[PDB]
Amino acid sequence: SMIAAYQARCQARVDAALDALFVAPREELQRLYEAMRYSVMNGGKRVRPLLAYAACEALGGAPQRADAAACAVELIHAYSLVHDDLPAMDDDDLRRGQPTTHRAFDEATAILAADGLQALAFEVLADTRRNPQEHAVCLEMLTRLARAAGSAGMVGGQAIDLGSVGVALDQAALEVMHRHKTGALIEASVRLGALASGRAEPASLAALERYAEAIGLAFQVQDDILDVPTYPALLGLEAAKGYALELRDLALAALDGFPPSADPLRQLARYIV
Amino acid sequence: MIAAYQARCQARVDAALDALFVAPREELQRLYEAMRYSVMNGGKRVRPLLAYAACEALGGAPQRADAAACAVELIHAYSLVHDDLPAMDDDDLRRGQPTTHRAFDEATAILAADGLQALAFEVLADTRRNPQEHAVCLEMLTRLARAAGSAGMVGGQAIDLGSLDQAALEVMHRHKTGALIEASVRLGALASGRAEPASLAALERYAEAIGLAFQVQDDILDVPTYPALLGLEAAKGYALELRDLALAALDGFPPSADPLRQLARYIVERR
Ligand SMILES: CC(C)=CCC/C(C)=C/COP(=O)(O)OP(=O)(O)O
Ligand SMILES: CC(C)=CCC/C(C)=C/COP(=O)(O)OP(=O)(O)O
Ligand SMILES: [Mg+2]
Ligand SMILES: [Mg+2]
Ligand SMILES: [Mg+2]
Ligand SMILES: [Mg+2]
Numbered sequence A: 001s002m003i004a005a006y007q008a009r010c011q012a013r014v015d016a017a018l019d020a021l022f023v024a025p026r027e028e029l030q031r032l033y034e035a036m037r038y039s040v041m042n043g044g045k046r047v048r049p050l051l052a053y054a055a056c057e058a059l060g061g062a063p064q065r066a067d068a069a070a071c072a073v074e075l076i077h078a079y080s081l082v083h084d085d086l087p088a089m090d091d092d093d094l095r096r097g098q099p100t101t102h103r104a105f106d107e108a109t110a111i112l113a114a115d116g117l118q119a120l121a122f123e124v125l126a127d128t129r130r131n132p133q134e135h136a137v138c139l140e141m142l143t144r145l146a147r148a149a150g151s152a153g154m155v156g157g158q159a160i161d162l163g164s165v166g167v168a169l170d171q172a173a174l175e176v177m178h179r180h181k182t183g184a185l186i187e188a189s190v191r192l193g194a195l196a197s198g199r200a201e202p203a204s205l206a207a208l209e210r211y212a213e214a215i216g217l218a219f220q221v222q223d224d225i226l227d228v229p230t231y232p233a234l235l236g237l238e239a240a241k242g243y244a245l246e247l248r249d250l251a252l253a254a255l256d257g258f259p260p261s262a263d264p265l266r267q268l269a270r271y272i273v
Numbered sequence B: 001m002i003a004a005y006q007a008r009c010q011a012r013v014d015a016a017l018d019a020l021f022v023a024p025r026e027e028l029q030r031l032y033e034a035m036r037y038s039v040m041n042g043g044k045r046v047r048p049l050l051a052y053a054a055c056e057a058l059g060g061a062p063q064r065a066d067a068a069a070c071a072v073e074l075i076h077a078y079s080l081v082h083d084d085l086p087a088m089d090d091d092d093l094r095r096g097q098p099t100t101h102r103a104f105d106e107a108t109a110i111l112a113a114d115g116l117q118a119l120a121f122e123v124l125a126d127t128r129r130n131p132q133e134h135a136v137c138l139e140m141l142t143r144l145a146r147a148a149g150s151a152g153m154v155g156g157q158a159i160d161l162g163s164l165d166q167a168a169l170e171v172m173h174r175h176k177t178g179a180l181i182e183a184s185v186r187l188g189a190l191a192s193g194r195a196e197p198a199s200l201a202a203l204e205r206y207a208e209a210i211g212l213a214f215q216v217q218d219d220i221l222d223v224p225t226y227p228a229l230l231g232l233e234a235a236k237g238y239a240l241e242l243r244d245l246a247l248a249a250l251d252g253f254p255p256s257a258d259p260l261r262q263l264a265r266y267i268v269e270r271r
């Protein structure tokens, strides 16, 4: 509704900023840059940039302050999907009905494009012209994204995912995996946007992290539900729907006491489920 | 002398690196072991030596460059894991030991190295591990991101795989190894707290020169190579010319720059 409009603005905005990053500095690197562009500019919904923009606004910041954050999270997200698709992992020919990067190009070029996307994510955050926050904040943003994207976060999640094959997984184990594999980067999108506001404080950061923890799981539960070891398989379908709504509630609760500028986050929570 | 310097820089950076590979939980133990296996492999740590030496050339205590030294070796290590993969060079061995994708598996190697890249940036942005002025930490991060990315190292690898005359070979080398050798030098100089534009420019000239000298000398020792393009004797001549340009860039630097001068000589004096 309003969240639909909010999403569309966030998407337009981050796409414009992203599209500008893919000019090869010289002719020999053209194909690499085209693969980088192919990997990012794929019509994705940009939830992570929406979360950075919305967390910035929830704390009273003008959203353009989060522009760099919004690019950096989507850069990390994009590189992850390129690697996930590779023959050594999920070996997928298609993502959302289009050829994956390694299929469109080749496997080496895909690995390289995504490796470049990761470096570019950090480069954008450290660039004080693109990310004009106080220097201490730029460094906290970098620290946070590096931890979230690395072996103790997202990459670790993917390892947990690949080490759980054939192993019988219970709910607690499935959630550990989700918290790493997708939770860490969702929490970082929120944290980074909040930092970009220039008004972050420990209490408001802690609340927004509770919000992010809840919605990050809600996305996964709801995906499983729409697809019908999954949440519906563990709990049954009706109980899985119940858990989704419980997560929405914990998200709305974490936003207790926030101003009206936090409505986009409240709406997103409701929307997911 | 430069051998004793190299052994100290190696010991120092290995101690700092070794501390980074503790899995925060049991589900990640195998990933962290693959990470450790990929970095703690008895490598010579030239990039860390370069950071330590550039820091000392400008008068800085070398421990100031600890984070820089870790970050550049982290990026170096991740790059070699990816280069060894079946999609690229498909190598079973590196320096006679199984590669990461063989000791573990292909996915775990990809992932370990991805984690190494993130850890390199994490180490520089962490003001406790890299306790410089904030603006310096950001410049260090900027420099390393540009050098490690598609406009540097990764772009080099793309040029390499997509490949030839001397100018083209040098473009490839400048990207594939040059950018990170230059960044190691730059990062260590930044860490000194005493960097200035003129010094930074001189150190960059030094780095461009030695980055290429490594490659020329490797080709010579092996005998689209420097010997094949220039001739064998002309290639040896060029190696000395590069050492000289490196030493000339350091004109007017004090005696604390000797480790850098000795490294330049060492590169072309090898075997
Ligand atoms: C390479 C790395 C670090 C990947 C982790 C991040 C990620 C979002 C994986 C996709 O999961 P999936 O394979 O379950 O989802 P999809 O169905 O989208 O492929
Ligand atoms: C972004 C990536 C993966 C970069 C690779 C960088 C690099 C130094 C590769 C080694 O080159 P090589 O294959 O010529 O030498 P070696 O003989 O050591 O494999
Ligand atoms: Mg997968
Ligand atoms: Mg997949
Ligand atoms: Mg699922
Ligand atoms: Mg190789």
Ligand SMILES: [Mg+2]
Residues within 6 Å of the ligand: B083, B088, B089, B160
């Ligand atoms: Mg190679």
